[PDB]
Amino acid sequence: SENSVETQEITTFHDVETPNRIDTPMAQDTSSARNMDDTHSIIQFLQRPVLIDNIEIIAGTTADANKPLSRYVLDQQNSQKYVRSWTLPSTVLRAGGKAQKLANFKYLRCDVQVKLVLNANPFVAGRMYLAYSPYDDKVDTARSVLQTSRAGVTGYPGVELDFQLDNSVEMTIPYASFQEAYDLVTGTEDFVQLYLFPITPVLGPKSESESSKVDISVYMWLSNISLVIPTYRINP
Amino acid sequence: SENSVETQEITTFHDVETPNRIDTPMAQDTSSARNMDDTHSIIQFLQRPVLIDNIEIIA
Amino acid sequence: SKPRNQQQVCPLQNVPAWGYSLYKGIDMSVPLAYDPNNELGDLKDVFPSAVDEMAIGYVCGNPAVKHVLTWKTTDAIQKPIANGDDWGGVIPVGMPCYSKSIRTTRISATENRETEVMDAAPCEYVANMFSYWRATMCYRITVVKTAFHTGRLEIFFEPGVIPVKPTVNNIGPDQDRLTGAVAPSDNNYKYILDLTNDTEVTIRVPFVSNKMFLKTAGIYGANSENNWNFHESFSGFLCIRPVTKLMAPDTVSDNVSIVVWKWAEDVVVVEPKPLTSGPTQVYRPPPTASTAVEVLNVEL
Amino acid sequence: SKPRNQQQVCPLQNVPAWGYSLYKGIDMSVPLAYDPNNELGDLKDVFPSA
Amino acid sequence: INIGNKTNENVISFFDSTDAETQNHNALMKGCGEFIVNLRTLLRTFRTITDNWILQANTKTPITDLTNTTDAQGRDYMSYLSYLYRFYRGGRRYKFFNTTPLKQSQTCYIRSFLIPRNYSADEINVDGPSHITYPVINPVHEVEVPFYSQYRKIPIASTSDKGYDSSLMYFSNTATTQIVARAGNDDFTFGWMIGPPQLQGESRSVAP
């Protein structure tokens, strides 16, 4: 009669009395959408793998995709040559429609998974290396992966990427930032910044009209997430 | 909440509620005037002899 | 009976007053007294309280009025009270200061001195000493109404960057961005008070913003030039904007008052030095407006 | 919590290397090493006599 | 619903993840180490109240020629918490750091004595509990004034009564400019809390 303080998700009210609320006579169950699928939570929804990139290699090669790793890097013009650059988590959040499903939240504590499905013919050899380097375009110039030697590139954490032995890799890129719980509104996140390096050049028969392809693909999804503070904004 | 009738020496009040009275956090004792003399009541004070008259006789 | 010395050579460094800025450790200050065991008594019968009156749990637990609002029938709904306060409806959650008044005197025919004068809540006044803070804030919003004023009033949190207006000498909030229908209040933590018979509310806001400690700069040197420290000091703002307009008859007055109290519980601090670009100068009010205040400088 | 000093005045004589020509007594020579507890082994397997 | 008013006090809370007192230990153990609790502990640290105090040679100088000036500013912790309180008890430790261009044709030394508060120079004697240092061999003067008072506590800036507790007199021989730092002694504490006065910000003094 005096105490009407009820609680919604994140919302509380303050009335004089309980305002004479009427409702359903009996809450009988109806159409069977509950019996067709269980409800997917928002921590369950940010664990779906997405098709991000589709990298094709031909050897070849006129392009930069088969320049091998330099044994020495003597100057910043002749930096280390790579394939692609994924600037996590700003790539994994925008793709797959995730950012239009974690809107109206503020802080995030994620761990990015990376999987490489690989599919090449038996008549082609080679080897790559999938290194990640946190703050790789924030730290001073000499400390980045793109300026060190071949022994220094491979010494970074990662996994071997041989063709005939590995058709799938599982790498767990950790929560690797100094700030507690990544900001989203006015976001400049870009903490861990991934790379893909070829160690040996891709090898095939030197006669052409043969089409020695590689066709890498990249899957990423989050893990061990905690999504906490509600807001009204978001970056587009 | 309804019954605020308090009593002073010879004086009584009548309010709607007890008017949200705040007071000292802890009533710690202070300077020692209580330790120097006991309090003299008004029945104790009207028992002090007074020098009224001073009568001199010469023969 | 007079043997030779058996002790090793004690090494040495000549440091008079080694580590004087620490509250622990035996200090070599000579007492100018009769007894080396000079012991004052305990705290019995001296101060007329029994509460330990210096713990930060009690000093910062002291309520102070910050804002006095005037909520009118002229003012619209779903829009905070913009009154020339200038903060008013947008109270920044956080322990250090956020407001300032500027005193403009004259020196020559074309030169003036603009001295920033700040108000000081006791939660604010302690935080000026220390550099980095972390505290669970509190606010006790009270409506000063009659028996006949009703309505519904909303207070909602928002974490992060506060909307501002940088000026030449001060920062004002921006009520162009908090109106509408351009900034909804449907996903924030909120409380919808009722002016029918409920009057007061205390809205405890714990500390959550992506860092272990914020800064205690606040509004010192906050202007168009230097306003990084103002953003990294609060974890957002409360916002008092009305859901439903004030319903008042012609007998009672159309103006009600909203008094915003402030304190901070569970306070912890980091360094015993001021983070500001100036010493802790306490503002002494001049007798006459033509007189100026002595300024502490940074040479040694 | 920060009381006054209770120790007496320690008397003093400035003698660097007091009694250096004695085979006993702890000497103040600074080792130019990584570990203060720099301990060579015993005389086992070094000199080919026992 | 009737025409009237109630109080019905509501301590309603926002974010309620964990207990607050538990996270504050975990936050300071990785960011501070030191856990500041009581402001009584900040009256034990010697913060420098002046940077330069050019004392004229051969003059018994009371520190109240500097204390009346430097209790206004609140630069240290004694005069900054002189505004949040009203009373105080306990003695004031003083340290004096020499910064003089010393001269070899003299023997520089430093004395110290006691006066009761707010007396002038000549109206007190000199035989009392003393201390002496020699700044050629010891640049720091390590002096603690005790608490010898008539009253159990002292309010700030009192009435026409004077000489009701003791403080320092500072005697030298040469024109020694110094640094002065201070804090209260082991049993120095304030009391009787009030609300705080204002603060003063930056004074950049733009022309228009």
Q: Is residue C32 a contact partner of residue C216, using CB atoms and an 8 Å limit?
A: no
Is the Cβ pair B28, C51 closer than 8 Å? no
Instruction: For chain C, say whether B20 makes contact (Cβ under 8 Å).
Output: no
Q: State how far the Cα of E74 lies from the Cα of E106, in Å rounded to an integer.
A: 37
Q: Which residues of A touch E17 (CB under 8 A)?
A: 228
Is the Cβ pair E42, C39 closer than 8 Å? no
Q: State how far the Cα of D46 lies from the Cα of C60, in Å rounded to an integer.
A: 71
Instruction: For chain E, say whether C269 makes contact (Cβ under 8 Å).
Output: yes
Q: Is residue C102 a contact partner of residue C168, using CB atoms and an 8 Å limit?
A: no
Q: State how far the Cα of E96 lies from the Cα of E46, in Å rounded to an integer.
A: 11
C145 Ramachandran zone, left/alpha/beta (phi>0; psi -120 to 50): beta
Which structure tokens are listed for A83?
A: 């394939």
Q: State how far the Cα of C132 lies from the Cα of B54, in Å rounded to an integer.
A: 82
Q: Which helix (H) or strand (E) holds A44?
A: helix A42-45
Structural domain boundaries, residue A231: 1-236
Structural domain boundaries, residue E25: 1-208
What residue type is C133 in one-letter code? W
Q: Is residue E113 a contact partner of residue C63, using CB atoms and an 8 Å limit?
A: no
**Looking at the partner chain, which of C110, C279, C299 has a beta carbon nearest the beta carbon of E207?**
C110
Nearest residue on chain E to A13, alpha-carbon basis: E12
- C231 secondary structure, DSSP code: G
Q: Which helix (H) or strand (E) holds C269?
A: strand C256-269
How many residues belong to chain B? 59
Nearest residue on chain E to C279, alpha-carbon basis: E75
What residue type is A122 in one-letter code? P
Indicate the SS3 state at residue C122.
helix
Strands A197-203 and E92-98: unpaired
Instruction: For chain A, say whether E8 makes contact (Cβ under 8 Å).
Output: yes
Q: Which residues of E touch C280 (CB under 8 A)?
A: 74-75, 80, 199
Q: State how far the Cα of C56 lies from the Cα of C53, in Å rounded to an integer.
A: 9
Nearest residue on chain C to B31, alpha-carbon basis: C45
Domain count, chain C: 1
Looking at the DSSP bridge assignments, the partners of residue B18 are none
- Return the closest-CA partner of residue C234 out of C222, C250, C218, C211: C218
Q: State how far the Cα of A191 lies from the Cα of A193, in Å rounded to an integer.
A: 6
Rounded (10°) CA dihedral C85, C88, C91, C92: -30
Q: Is residue C216 a contact partner of residue C132, using CB atoms and an 8 Å limit?
A: yes
Which method resolved this structure?
cryo-EM
Domain count, chain A: 1
Which structure tokens are listed for E2?
A: 């009737």
Q: Is residue C240 a contact partner of residue C91, using CB atoms and an 8 Å limit?
A: yes
C-alpha D18, offset from chain centre: 12
Q: State how far the Cα of A169 lies from the Cα of A157, in Å rounded to an integer.
A: 14
- Return the closest-CA partner of residue A12 out of C203, C241, C124, E24: C203
Interface test mutation site (partner A, options E7, E13, E15, max chain A beta carbons within 10 A): E15
Q: State how far the Cα of C89 lies from the Cα of E184, in Å rounded to an integer.
A: 43
Rg (CA), chain D: 20
Question: Which residue has 């098709």 as its token pair?
Answer: A51
DSSP string, chain E: --SS------EEES--SS-HHHHHHHHHHHHTS----BGGGGGSS-EEEEEEEEPPSS--EETHHHHHHHTTS--SSTTTTTSS-SEEES-EEEEEEE-----TTS---EEEEEEETT--STTS-S-SS-EEE-TTT--EEEEE-----SSSSEESS--S---SSEEEEEEESS--EEEEEEEE-TT-EEES------EE--------
> Any residues with CB less than 8 A from the CB of C206 and at least 6 apart, and which?
C136, C137, E13, E14, E15, E16, E17, E20
Task: Give ∠ CA C34-C40-C41 in degrees, rounded to 5.
Answer: 145
Indicate the SS3 state at residue B4.
strand
What is the least distance, in Å, from the CA of E1 to any CA of chain A?
Answer: 7
Q: State how far the Cα of C188 lies from the Cα of A35, in Å rounded to an integer.
A: 33
Q: Which helix (H) or strand (E) holds C151?
A: strand C150-158
Q: Which helix (H) or strand (E) holds A85?
A: strand A85-87
Is the Cβ pair C212, E113 closer than 8 Å? no
E137 Ramachandran zone, left/alpha/beta (phi>0; psi -120 to 50): alpha
Q: Which residues of A touch C194 (CB under 8 A)?
A: 14-16
Residues in A 212-231 with any Cβ partner in E closer than 8 A: 228-229
Task: Give ∠ CA B36-C39-E35 in degrees, rounded to 5.
Answer: 120
Q: State how far the Cα of A142 lies from the Cα of A219, in Å rounded to an integer.
A: 30
What is the least distance, in Å, from the CA of B43 to any CA of chain C?
Answer: 32
- Return the closest-CA partner of residue C266 out of C82, C121, C138: C138
Q: Is residue A184 a contact partner of residue A234, using CB atoms and an 8 Å limit?
A: yes
Chains E and A touch (3+ CB pairs under 8 A): yes
What are φ and ψ of residue E205, in 5° steps? 60, 65
Is the Cβ pair D4, E186 closer than 8 Å? yes
What is the least distance, in Å, from the CA of C272 to any CA of chain A?
Answer: 24
Number of CB pairs < 8 Å for A and E?
10
Nearest residue on chain A to E13, alpha-carbon basis: A12
Structural domain boundaries, residue C20: 1-300
Q: State how far the Cα of C171 lies from the Cα of C156, in Å rounded to an integer.
A: 22
Q: Which helix (H) or strand (E) holds C124?
A: helix C122-127
Is the Cβ pair C221, E201 closer than 8 Å? yes
Q: State how far the Cα of C108 lies from the Cα of C238, in Å rounded to an integer.
A: 43
Question: Which residue has 């070829």 as its token pair?
Answer: A198
Instruction: For chain E, say whether C76 makes contact (Cβ under 8 Å).
Output: no
Resolution at which this structure was determined, Å = 3.2
> Any residues with CB less than 8 A from the CB of C267 and at least 6 apart, and which?
C56, C57, C60, C95, C123, C126, C133, C134, C135, C136
What is the least distance, in Å, from the CA of A16 to any CA of chain E?
Answer: 7
What are φ and ψ of residue C99, in 5° steps? -125, 160
Nearest residue on chain C to B24, alpha-carbon basis: C49
Q: Is residue C235 a contact partner of residue C214, using CB atoms and an 8 Å limit?
A: yes
Question: Which residue has 């500041």 as its token pair?
Answer: E36
What residue type is E145 in one-letter code? V
Domain count, chain E: 1
